[PDB]
Amino acid sequence: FQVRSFEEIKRSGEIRIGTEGAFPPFNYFDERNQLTGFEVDLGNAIAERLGLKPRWIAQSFDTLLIQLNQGRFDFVIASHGITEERARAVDFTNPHYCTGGVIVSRKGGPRTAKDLQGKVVGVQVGTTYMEAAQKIPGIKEVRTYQRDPDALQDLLAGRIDTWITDRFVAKEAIKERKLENTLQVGELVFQERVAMAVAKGNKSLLDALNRALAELMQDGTYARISQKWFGEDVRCK
C-alpha cells in the first residue's frame, strides 16, 4: 500500500493494476479462469510499452477507486465512466473508449426511460447505471447487484423488468447466450467517456499512462485490440 510515482514503478519493474473481472468483454475471467478482455489486453500493451511487468489484482468493482487511493494498486482499468464526483476522487487519464448505458428488457418489455414508470430496474452497485436509474422518475424499485451479470440473470428470471448496463456488454451477452429472441436492447439512456484512473495527485503515473495510450492509438495497437474484441474501433471520436 503506497502511491508510487512512475520512476518508482519503473525501478521495481512491475506495475500493479486493479480491475474487477466480472464485466465481459471488457475485463473478466474466462472459462479457464484467466483474466482477459479488451481492458486487460490494453492494460498489458500499456505496461509493455512502458517496460513494466503487469500484476493484476481483481476486486469488487465498488471498492476499486477507494483502494487505488490507498495505494493497493498503481492504476485501475475497469470501465469507469468519467463523472464529476469520480474526477474529484481520482485522476482520470484521457479516455480509452467511449460508450453508453442502455435499457435492456425481455421482448415486449420497457424500451425507454418513460416506459420504466412502475417498473423494477436492476443495476450494478456503484455504477453510472445506478446513478442514471436514480434520476429517472417513477421507477417502482431499483434493485442493486454486486456484479452486473447477476442483474442479467434476474432479468432472464423475470425478477426485474429491465437491466441498465453498457451497450457493448448488452450486445455481447445477447450473442454469447443466444438471447436474440428473448431480450431486446432499448434506448441509449446516456453516453460516457471511460478512462483509467490513478490515485488523486499521482501526476507522474498519469503522464506515463496518457503517453502510452496516445502511442498505442497512433501505432496501430489500439486498433488491433479494439478490432479483436469488437470488430470495430471503439475509441472516443
Ligand SMILES: NCCSC[C@H](N)C(=O)O
Ligand atoms: N468492471 C465493471 C465496471 S462497470 C462501469 C460503468 N461504466 C461505470 O462507469 O459505472
